Amino acid sequence: SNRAVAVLRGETVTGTIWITQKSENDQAVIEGEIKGLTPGLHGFHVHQYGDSTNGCISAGPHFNPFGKTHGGPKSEIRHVGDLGNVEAGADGVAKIKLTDTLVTLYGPNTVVGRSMVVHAGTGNAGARAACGVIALAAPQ
């Protein structure tokens, strides 16, 4: 499909994030809303797995298919799953629209079946506050 959606679930943070992409060669658009955030900037990431058998823990690590490293030559590689930080507006909702990412719904790096995770900013989920599987949706 040219359209996917993640419904984020968490104790307090929830949301709905759409991904739309006309073809393998076109840039995807990520758009939606995240609710229940404490005020300020929070991390927003694609993680490797959609597995939600263990809350947001089973999402596994950041999705970094190109292998960006901390330093050295490969530190200049783009981290595909890094969607920056997000924040709620005055109305308490974060309106997300990201048009310049490398996220794709096609080819070997497709994110279908993986997860989107919101990171706050103590427990075994670290800062992971909500997560949802990137699901196939009806094409537009």
Binding site for a second copy (CB under 8 A): 1, 4-5, 7, 16, 48-53, 58, 60, 112-115, 133-138
- Torsion 90-94-95-97 (CA) sign: positive
Whole-number Å distance between alpha carbons of 52 and 19: 20
Residue 47 is assigned to a ligand binding site:
yes
Residues near 9 by beta carbon (within 8 Å), at least 6 away in sequence: 52, 130, 131, 132
Residues near 90 by beta carbon (within 8 Å), at least 6 away in sequence: none
Burial of 55 (0-12, 13-18, 19+ CB in 10 A): middle
Q: Report in angstroms how near the CB of residue 23 gets to a second copy at its nearest.
A: 16
Residue 42 is assigned to a ligand binding site:
no
Contact 126, 59 (CB under 8 A): no
Residue 45 is assigned to a ligand binding site:
yes
Residue 51 is assigned to a ligand binding site:
no
Of the pair 75, 140, the CB lying nearest a second copy is at: 140
Q: Report in angstroms how near the CB of residue 9 gets to a second copy at its nearest.
A: 9
Query: What are the residue numbers of the active site?
Result: 45, 47, 62, 70, 79, 82, 119, 128
Instruction: Pick out the residues of the known binding site for Cu cation.
Output: 45, 47, 62, 119
Which residues are documented as binding site for Zn(2+)?
A: 62, 70, 79, 82
What residue numbers does the annotated binding site cover?
Answer: 45, 47, 62, 70, 79, 82, 119
